[PDB]
Design a protein around this ligand. Structure first.
Ligand SMILES: Nc1nc2ccc(C(F)(F)F)cc2s1
Ligand SMILES: Nc1nc2ccc(C(F)(F)F)cc2s1
Ligand SMILES: [Mg+2]
Ligand SMILES: [Mg+2]
Lengths: 546, 546
């Protein structure tokens, strides 16, 4: 029967409420109890505050009216307001102290996840103060999780007027008995209750959620820890830069602040960063999540040499030039990890900081051909399989769904063996026609990759492995250097190819290297352990790139 | 005969040279004359410095080697280095003091403009210092003006070794006698001179340019003031955001720092900001230059109401949400000017600062229908002409080249009369079939607009004028408000429609409004007076949005 859930902002989705700041302010200042609440509410439907809430006046215009109300209330209560008494000051503090009430948000998210339509209905104001960005940020962070945001001051109506509730119902396309409405102010619940909506009077969050759970019959309290926010491709800003006549690079872009360029591995996509992109933007960065050359909406020329590390790096430099960025933080996984270490070594002036997931920095051995070095380690046999043009392409393109569903597996989910792939005749020779779906991914997410790889297939991607010799000669030029910019290496306990021990000598070349390590994490790090990846990157960003 | 010009960076394109910093440092510190230059050059082809210049080691690795060289030189000269003597410190100061030598750049630009191939050939280093961003910025600013940038440390060779000159020639695809090469170091000129290149020994800039002028036969000195840098469409980052199912907005994006959203007028394009986009990025902003809805690569739905101010503004807000920007500075011209004032009034929390070129803020008159208000002023008659769907579209789409070449005219170039357009039967009834080309635009630039308007024509654009009533009712809701965020109004002396006097009462609504005024400037402000527009916007940005 219930299909919709509506939440207030103040005192419900965000805490502490600014009304309670009026209580504590009175106390702090030893003013008459309720004096500030009286001044705030003065004149009722025709007072200063309603005009504010209705969008008639802005916050800055209101401040002096509330001041005057405070004067009038104090005279009649026969007291004096403190020297320095400051409504602007009081409200700036209050409004910056107010934060998202995380458990309420996560309950709203869960209900949306089970198919509820969700909304924020709030009495709020047009905020034109010097410090208004604080609130614009809060509202952005909250509103992206909801179907609708209805603001008294944009619609010209206020709780508890009955018309806003009708406007609510009409926005929801729902009848009153399909809606639960939560509010901390009982007078605002009354009109919902009159039309027969379920209402919840929100005092402490846990009790409200207990009521919310009982009435929707969905578990909201004590639920396991949710994944980070993911990205919907068609809600993102998509960018395109031509780095040379036949080559355009695509990327998705979110956030403001220092530029952070994410570089995926093989055979992946910008979308492999889907759990990091919102979290890093939210953390105060400008994320640029590439399709690396060969992939997705980026160009994919056929020639092998178009994909050697030298050419790929020069092109990432051009990509910064054309966007007008003197630097970016470069963060890479798997092949993209190898690439960002090379960016650090050859273009340190363009790299604000460098991080790699899984891929260690190992200097080229000038005394051993790279092919030889690859044959030394049985777990790289799949790279030799990749050498002969066409062979891996035919197997990997043959059935894309089976391809990604085989590849993208957590460590406990019967990972492909990386072992004696050439001898066996292919990567999938010993895997099912229809693999089961990994816990890491949904069927829809597998189908995004499938549709991406329909544009160019696997030739470009495989070519990243076909420049062993050419990359070795380029790398050899850098053997005298060290990496002395800020650097982070993140190892994954259960990556059985890019093993954590392979990174053990990195401090010889990167003396101030910082590290994170993720346990129980297989090769597909960002979607295996997105929560831990996010925490490790944001902490290193804030300390080293900030 | 001469087809190519090559410039050094230090002492030629950038001043003062870091070598002269070695001179002044010696003097400042009363060290033996030339001691620092000896230490720098110690070991010659096999010393620390050549290894640096060749890319063998990074700047941070070199610093302690130069230190040691300074110690060794001082011992043998039987002196002591100062307490606190600091190579890192000396070079940080020197490298940040170094700036683009503007007259040399503008000469290089001019030669490129007359068809020279131009290049920077420099001995430089891999810069990994904490403060490396300074130089990455310099090099970006310079390199975008040249065909090639050849850096000793990326190519593994140094002036004066003969191989770099051969590598230069081969890059230029030019024979030695077609090249002029300019350098402040005579030993570096010698090998160019050996192959028979024209060389110029650069001491003071003016004499070098005098030589450069004599030998190329092009005027380089005392030339008139050049236009600001323009944008080549196919070198820009192009972005696309879907703000709702049928509507995607396109924009071009350059620079980093606070977001600055440029909103063009009718019937224009992101490209009408072409002279502002590089200058504002260079000034430390992230420019987002829109195709506004109806135009270019943005969607252009047919329905009139899709283009009322309310819908257009909500969509600009969604555009920020999806890009993850809590605010932007909004700068508008003509119709975009009207729109940004509305953004200031209805979404002050999303607008960091607002500026308009030409378009004044005038509050809706609640006592007079807007049509009536438009009929009151003969110079708005062209807006009535625009009302009847199809009529203006047929005239404007009939011949696009004639359309833009008629519209885009400086004040002295027989502007269209805005006068009695309905009576006369059209905007062009009294203009030539083939207008001459305005001084403001090139034939190629007219053809960019023509190709843009081939995608959707004039229906969407004209619809911005077809919501008089609907915009009036929305505006009336804001009549109690003031605009109290940072605001700039820029009037144009010879805009005979959006006249400067029309802005005279703006301080009643925007009490802290700031102003600029541009004399001898017609309606197409950004391309009429791009230099003055750039200076006025950057100054107001740095003081009010920074
Ligand atoms: N630990 C690792 N598992 C895998 C599985 C597949 C591949 C692929 F075939 F895609 F390259 C690389 C690795 S690395
Ligand atoms: N001073 C002014 N000149 C013109 C010329 C044309 C138009 C157009 F037809 F494009 F709307 C508007 C103006 S405003
Ligand atoms: Mg409340
Ligand atoms: Mg020099």
């Amino acid at each position: 029967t219930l299909r919709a859930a509506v939440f207030d902002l103040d005192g419900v989705l965000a805490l502490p409420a600014v009304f309670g700041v009026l209580g504590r302010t009175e106390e702090a200042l030893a003013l008459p109890r309720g004096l500030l609440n009286d001044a705030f509410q003065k004149g009722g439907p025709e007072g200063a505050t309603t005009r504010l809430m209705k969008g008639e006046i802005t916050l800055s215009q209101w401040i002096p009216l509330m001041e005057e109300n405070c004067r009038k209330c104090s005279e009649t209560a026969k007291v004096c307001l403190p020297k320095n008494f400051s409504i602007k000051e009081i409200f700036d503090k209050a409004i910056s102290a107010r934060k998202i009430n995380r458990p309420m948000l996560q309950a709203a998210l869960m209900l949306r996840k089970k198919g509820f339509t969700t909304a924020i209905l709030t009495n709020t104001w047009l905020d034109d103060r010097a410090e208004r960005d604080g609130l614009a940020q809060l509202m952005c962070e909250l509103k992206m999780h909801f179907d609708f945001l209805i603001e008294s001051c944009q619609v010209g109506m206020v709780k508890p007027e009955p018309q806003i509730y009708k406007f609510l119902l009409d926005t929801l396309k729902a009848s009153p008995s399909e809606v639960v409405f939560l509010d901390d102010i009982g007078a605002n619940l009354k009109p919902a209750r009159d039309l027969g909506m379920v209402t919840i009077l929100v005092q402490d969050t846990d009790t409200a959620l207990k009521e919310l759970e009982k009435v929707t019959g969905i578990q909201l309290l004590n639920t396991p820890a949710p994944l980070p926010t993911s990205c919907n491709p068609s809600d993102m800003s998509h960018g395109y830069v031509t780095v040379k006549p036949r080559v355009r690079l695509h990327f998705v872009e979110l956030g403001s602040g220092p530029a952070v360029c994410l570089c995926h591995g093989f055979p992946e996509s910008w979308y492999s960063w889907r759990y990091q992109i919102p979290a890093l933007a939210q953390a105060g960065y400008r994320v640029l999540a590439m399709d690396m050359k060969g992939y997705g909406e980026s160009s994919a020329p056929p020639e092998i040499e178009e994909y050697c590390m030298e050419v790929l790096c020069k092109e990432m430099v051009t990509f910064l030039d054309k966007l007008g960025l003197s630097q970016a933080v470069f963060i890479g996984h798997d092949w993209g990890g190898m690439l960002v270490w090379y960016m650090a070594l050859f273009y340190p002036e363009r790299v604000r900081a460098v991080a790699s997931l899984n891929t260690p920095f190992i200097p080229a051995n000038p005394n051993m051909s790279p092919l030889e070095s690859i044959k030394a380690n049985p777990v790289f046999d799949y790279q030799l399989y990749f050498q002969e043009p066409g062979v891996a392409e035919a197997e990997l393109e043959q059935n894309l769904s089976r391809t990604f569903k085989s590849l993208f597996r957590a460590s406990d989910e019967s990972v492909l063996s990386m072992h004696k792939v050439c001898e066996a005749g292919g990567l999938f020779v010993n895997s099912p026609e229809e693999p089961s779906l990994s816990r890491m991914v949904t069927e829809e997410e597998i189908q995004f990759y499938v549709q991406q790889f329909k544009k160019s297939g696997f030739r470009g991607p495989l070519n990243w492995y076909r420049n062993m010799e050419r990359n070795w000669k380029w790398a050899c030029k850098s053997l005298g250097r060290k990496i002395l910019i800020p650097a982070l290496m993140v190892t994954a306990e259960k990556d059985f190819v890019l093993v954590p021990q392979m990174s053990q000598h990195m401090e010889d070349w990167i003396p101030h290297l910082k590290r994170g390590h993720i346990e129980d994490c297989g090769h597909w790090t960002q979607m295996d352990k997105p929560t831990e990846v996010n925490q490790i990157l944001i902490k290193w960003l804030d300390s080293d790139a900030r």
